[PDB]
């Protein structure tokens, strides 16, 4: 659930691309219904570059799960 910003059941490169595009203003929101639940990977109730970094660590295999 967290990390799956397109709500398609997988967390992958496309969720990273969506997050990057969101932070650059190329998306108004995310396809997932619950944007904060999908995009907030550190629990601060904001979606920002810290969340982007956390997603990167996950896709690099540097972490295994999000600390919700």
Partner 1 sequence: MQTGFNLSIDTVEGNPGSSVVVPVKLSGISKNGISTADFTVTYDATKLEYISGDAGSIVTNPGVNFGINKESDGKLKVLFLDYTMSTGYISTDGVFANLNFNIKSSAAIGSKAEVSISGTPTFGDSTLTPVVAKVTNGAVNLE
When binding is defined by CB under 8 A, the residue of 14, 43, 49, 68 that contacts its own copies is: 14
Q: How far is CA 12 from CA 41, 44, 61, in A?
A: 14, 22, 12
Contact status: 46 vs Ca ion (CB under 5 A): yes
- Closer to its own copies at the Cβ: 5 or 54? 5
Count CA atoms closer than 13 A to 23's CA, side-chain side: 17
Q: Sign (positive/negative) of CA torsion 46, 48, 53, 55?
A: positive
Residue 68 touches which of Ca ion, its own copies, partner 1, none (Cβ within 5-8 Å per kind): none
Residue whose CB is less far from its own copies, 24 or 33: 24
């Amino acid at each position: 659930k967290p990390g799956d910003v397109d709500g398609n059941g997988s967390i992958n490169i496309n969720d990273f691309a969506l997050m990057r595009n969101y932070l650059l203003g190329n998306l108004k929101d995310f396809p997932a219904e619950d944007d904060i639940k999908a995009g907030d990977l550190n629990g601060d109730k904001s979606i920002n570059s810290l969340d982007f970094a956390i997603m990167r660590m996950y896709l690099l295999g540097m972490i295994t799960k999000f600390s919700v």
